Amino acid sequence: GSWGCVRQEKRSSGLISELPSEEGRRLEHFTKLRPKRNKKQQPTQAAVCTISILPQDGEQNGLMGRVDEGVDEFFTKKVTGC
Amino acid sequence: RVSDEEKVRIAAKFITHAPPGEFNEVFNDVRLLLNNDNLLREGAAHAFAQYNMDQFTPVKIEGYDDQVLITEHGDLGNGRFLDPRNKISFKFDHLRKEASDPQPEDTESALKQWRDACDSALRAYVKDHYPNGFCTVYGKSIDGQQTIIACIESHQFQPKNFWNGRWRSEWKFTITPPTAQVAAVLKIQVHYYEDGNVQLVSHKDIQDSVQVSSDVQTAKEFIKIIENAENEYQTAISENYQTMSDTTFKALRRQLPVTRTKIDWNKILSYKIGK
Amino acid sequence: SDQQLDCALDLMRRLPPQQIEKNLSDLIDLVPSLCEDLLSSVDQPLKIARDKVVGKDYLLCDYNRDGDSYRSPWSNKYDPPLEDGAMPSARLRKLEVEANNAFDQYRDLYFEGGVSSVYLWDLDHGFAGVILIKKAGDGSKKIKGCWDSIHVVEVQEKSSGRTAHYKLTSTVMLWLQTNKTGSGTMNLGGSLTRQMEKDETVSDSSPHIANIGRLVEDMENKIRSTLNEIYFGKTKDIVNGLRSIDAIPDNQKYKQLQRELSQVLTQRQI
Incomplete structure (x- = not known):
């Protein structure tokens, strides 16, 4: 219908923009919709387990796997894809 | 270990990864989770743009019967996109559904x-x-x-x-x-x-x-x-x-047990091969 | 912040379930105060751990976790090692041993393999427990598949009666993946959740485990049917609605009419 960042070409208040995303936030809240929390510990910075086998043949520590592996070495960085 | 910059990048990733047709729900979720609208606006525009772009968002310019695809390739760079077919210039507003006020684009x-x-x-x-x-x-x-x-x-x-x-x-x-x-x-x-x-x-x-x-x-x-x-x-x-x-x-998982009848729990709770 | 938890759960119900682990972690980075609530309310792919003393695998979940360690249902010990980790009472532990044994049989009968783990904990006027089942298919086939069962049951014991209230909330996570030339990478995964509540008689011939077992069994049989329908039925149909291999007999008639009626309504409404 209408557009304008702030200059507003048309003679109107045009108070609508990207603002619609701040709001004043509602203080009221459910607080406790249902019974469930099971508060416990966790903070320790650690987590190791993983399964065993499932993924195709390729992992270990292969960081390679992108279009045009060679960069800043050949005459040009020509890429078949993007 | 933690910073507002990292939280903004996280918020951005979630938003740009919303599934098709559910952008707003995901955005509202992240907004309430981040709980800091000032930080949210830092990468909003960028988030919205990236989403619509990698999602090939079909948009309808002011009046061309124009269903055109918002992609990177059509990103003018100034906040406007290209419509190679009708060949005009259109400014895409990311929050609102419409993208209007076109500009002819002689090629x-x-x-x-x-x-x-x-x-x-x-x-x-x-x-x-x-x-x-x-x-x-x-x-x-x-x-x-x-x-x-x-x-x-x-x-x-x-x-x-x-x-x-x-x-x-x-x-x-x-x-x-x-x-x-x-x-x-x-x-x-x-x-x-x-x-x-x-x-x-x-x-x-x-x-x-x-x-x-x-x-x-x-x-x-x-x-x-x-x-x-x-x-x-x-x-x-x-x-x-x-x-x-x-x-x-x-x-x-089978549909029915090997025994071919629902489980006899009384039997499982006592009956043993030997101890 | 309860709306936050609500928002956190809605978000996980929309982001690709394939990345639940990375996303949940990020979600916690974003809202560190909800860490405990999210670890307990957000279902994640089941991880296997090895009980070395017994030489048997067990499954990991928030319910057998204490800090950064997890309790084995076999040896009742924490790994990595902890000093005074949370343990069920000696009497509940005994019931826990029996529940693990009963569900091991349940697992073999319905899944013919895989791993199962049951962990229990006491409540004010009853007790609760989680039944975990993981079954991965033939690792030799082009298509990989994995079933994760996560059953959480709450038992409300009645003072007088030996009739108890059972509340079962179950989630089955079904993961399917394939890396074949013709399909590139195809990943069909996620989960379905169902809840059930029932008052039931508790007796010597029908003790707590039997009642929980019957509920789990009925629940899984129902979810198995729904999974088959949704995964191989509904998502396939949505896929066929996005594209069609055969030329779709184009229809001019309805489309031509549609434009004419439309523009009238806009210049009447705002």
């Missing part, structure tokens, strides 16, 4: 010859295979080389029935007469979320070597490459569905 008209042929040649392909599909072909010069970029998008959103889906296909045609090279990526995403979260995420990367002839000729050669590749992709998908349902799924 370079160098690769356009090919571009205009493929475009409406593909536009036929799409109307034949995508129920609610749309397409956008880009004619452009990529560091010296001429390339045709056809983007196809198709979707079906039914939030009231808790599901949405979308198809995305991108074909890059780089010309090097006599014969040229092809590069594409097909993508499918489906989301079902009534009392759960199930998603089909699939994509196929293809590279082909094609012989380049005329203008209206190479075009039909392309639309042919695409048609065969996408039919093959879709075909392999329906087959995969078949195997998963008649082989893989049945190998996970």
